[PDB]
Amino acid sequence: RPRFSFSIAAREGKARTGTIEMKRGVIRTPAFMPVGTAATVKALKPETVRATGADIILGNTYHLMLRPGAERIAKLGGLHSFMGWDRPILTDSGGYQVMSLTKQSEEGVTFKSHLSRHMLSPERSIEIQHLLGSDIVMAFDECTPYPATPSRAASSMERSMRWAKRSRDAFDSRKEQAENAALFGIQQGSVFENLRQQSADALAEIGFDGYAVGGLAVGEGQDEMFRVLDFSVPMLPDDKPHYLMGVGKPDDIVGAVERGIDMFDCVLPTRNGQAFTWDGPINIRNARFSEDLKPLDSECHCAVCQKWSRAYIHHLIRAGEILGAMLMTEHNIAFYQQLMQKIRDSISEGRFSQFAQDFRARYF
Amino acid sequence: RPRFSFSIAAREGKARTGTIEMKRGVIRTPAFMPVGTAATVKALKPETVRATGADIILGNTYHLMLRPGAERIAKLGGLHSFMGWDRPILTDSGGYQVMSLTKQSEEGVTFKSHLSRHMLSPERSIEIQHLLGSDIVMAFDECTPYPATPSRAASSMERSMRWAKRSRDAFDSRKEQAENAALFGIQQGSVFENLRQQSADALAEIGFDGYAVGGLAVGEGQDEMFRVLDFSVPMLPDDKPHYLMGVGKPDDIVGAVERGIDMFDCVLPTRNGQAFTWDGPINIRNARFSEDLKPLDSECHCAVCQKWSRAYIHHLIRAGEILGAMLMTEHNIAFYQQLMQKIRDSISEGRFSQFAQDFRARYF
Numbered sequence A, B: 001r002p003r004f005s006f007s008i009a010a011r012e013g014k015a016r017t018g019t020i021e022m023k024r025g026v027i028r029t030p031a032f033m034p035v036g037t038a039a040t041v042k043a044l045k046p047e048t049v050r051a052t053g054a055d056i057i058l059g060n061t062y063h064l065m066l067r068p069g070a071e072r073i074a075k076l077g078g079l080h081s082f083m084g085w086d087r088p089i090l091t092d093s094g095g096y097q098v099m100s101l102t103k104q105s106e107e108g109v110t111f112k113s114h115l116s117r118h119m120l121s122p123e124r125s126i127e128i129q130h131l132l133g134s135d136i137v138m139a140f141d142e143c144t145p146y147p148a149t150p151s152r153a154a155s156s157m158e159r160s161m162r163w164a165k166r167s168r169d170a171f172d173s174r175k176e177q178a179e180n181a182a183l184f185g186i187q188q189g190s191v192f193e194n195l196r197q198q199s200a201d202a203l204a205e206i207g208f209d210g211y212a213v214g215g216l217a218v219g220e221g222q223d224e225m226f227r228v229l230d231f232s233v234p235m236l237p238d239d240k241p242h243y244l245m246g247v248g249k250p251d252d253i254v255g256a257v258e259r260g261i262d263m264f265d266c267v268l269p270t271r272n273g274q275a276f277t278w279d280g281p282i283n284i285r286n287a288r289f290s291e292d293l294k295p296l297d298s299e300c301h302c303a304v305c306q307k308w309s310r311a312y313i314h315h316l317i318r319a320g321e322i323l324g325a326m327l328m329t330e331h332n333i334a335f336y337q338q339l340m341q342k343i344r345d346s347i348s349e350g351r352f353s354q355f356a357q358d359f360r361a362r363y364f
């Protein structure tokens, strides 16, 4: 396969469905990428993650650069070999996480490990992602708090764009990385239209393989997020993937696809007790499920719903058993993948708008 | 298959190898039974437990009678359906656990839940095991502390024998249970030969499908345990299974089989960091494994050793990841099953004594 090839097979309104071809495999879009925190998708073997239908997973750089360390993972053969996942892996730049879990400057960010002093710059972020063996590398950007004043949002966005250029050059100056991986730029600008436009223009001028909409899902609310996506997504190059970072609630995903987003990721799927169903989420810890012999969801095709009851999983979670987390997580990730499949098929068949309507009606 | 049929196919010295045929499946002996605490073998799906080679698992009655409750499990269809394990399940009587995790009397034991007031008697213990749908029911016995004076050991053993008779009658008075399950008696008597003899004689007079050697593995040390087994096992009926409760260290198992034991169980296999290998146990948390690309064990045929390195599992356990527990547990249970297979094959081939010798030499 080629290093990177995004092809759009069908469209409906702003929604698109297609594929991203990479050396390690094909990614069907719209896609949901399960998140692995410490070189592992919480409570699941890689084969199980694949069984749910995932084509790509997200690697949590921040934690990996601290433990076991980027250099160490490289010495061990790379993240793919390390964790046993041979398909595409997208890695975040680590900067956003650092400013959430820190001396900031135009050169980067210095911070103390939450679990020592560490320095992170656009150049070091790209190098770390290279050492991990990432297939999709994210540009190193600055976190823009919410709410943010227009002045602060502008300064942050402008810095991010300068860092986007440094990320591009660092990526290109490394032969092995430039020829085998892809690089995504990240749009910033808070909730301001003019800033989002400036960011999109700057990103397009530099040129990237894909464009992420960053700075959202920071407590603005779905209404506000959708409002921002309405004018923000069309600003990005149409022929490249659009990735909405950190968005995963089912209803958020459907609305985001309706607005042109092609890729998603979130830790929501992965012992809270919340299980997603087509009739809305349920918390399995609730006493009403203690003797419910039905599966988590009545239509779900996952292995958990074929073999165990709500009553059993209820018992597991309330007992604090590891198997409870294993089963809840497999079902949730399987549910998310089934949602993406329904979205892809509906778009391919030109009935996505209707699917969105039916989904919402039953989910709520 | 029949309700219960133990057949001895081959012998060498005091060691035996054969099968126990039951309605839900065949159990190969010597057998190792993985222990499931709360209706689950720690961090493993039932299919994975079976994949390791286990023919039967042990159900932890004490915890189940408290959560989710015996009556509830019965309402839900039984433990087999509940947890998704359709093969034989052996359940302990719960009395021993109660006196470890309490007003005692000739009628039974009253106690307060560690996680309310509850009463447990020989009759109630058998009923609980019936409600759980146990295939191999253990007689309700009294815990004999260690060390124990001859007088106290005698009183406890005598009470246990009276309770063994009550267990037998309770079991037989329940048609469905008597016709579909098996009942094992438990020998007591501490480390005293005369008491063990009295207990064995009492148990044989009553008549059981199998006989367990109880009261050992209570801090006496392998030397002392082996000394007690030397004279205790021959006292039990030769044509019925001999089950050593709570014994599982690899070397203990080999020595116990050399002394006539056919069944084992222990929580040792199931984030401590200890992984069993043919060259002895290792603690994966040790820094020396941080960049060790080799599998847990060089010969082990389990899925964990075929796919992941010590370095990765080291990272997982030190990071507190659930997958670490999943992988460590699967390997350990697989290792135990491989040990039992080597024991069974060596006995069948009349070279068990040699196997024991070679095992010890390399393990230590």
Ligand SMILES: NCc1cc(CSc2ccccc2)c2nc(N)[nH]c(=O)c2c1
Pocket: A035, A036, A058, A059, A060, A061, A092, A093, A094, A096, A097, A138, A141, A186, A213, A214, A215, A216, A217, A218, A245, A246, A247, A265, A266
């Ligand atoms: N709060 C939404 C969100 C989430 C992430 C994290 S995406 C991620 C990172 C590591 C593991 C899994 C997902 C972001 N990352 C970057 N670089 N920029 C953003 O604007 C942003 C916004």
Ligand SMILES: NCc1cc(CSc2ccccc2)c2nc(N)[nH]c(=O)c2c1
Pocket: B035, B036, B058, B059, B060, B061, B092, B093, B094, B096, B097, B138, B141, B186, B213, B214, B215, B216, B217, B218, B245, B246, B247, B265, B266
């Ligand atoms: N300390 C060894 C040991 C362990 C168990 C517990 S075996 C078990 C119970 C529940 C779950 C798994 C294994 C015992 N149980 C009974 N009834 N009698 C004993 O003498 C004895 C000695």
Ligand SMILES: [Zn+2]
Pocket: A296, A297, A300, A301, A302, A303, A304, A305, A306, A331, A332, A334, A335
């Ligand atoms: Zn499901």
Ligand SMILES: [Zn+2]
Pocket: B296, B297, B300, B301, B302, B303, B304, B305, B306, B331, B332, B334, B335
């Ligand atoms: Zn192994």
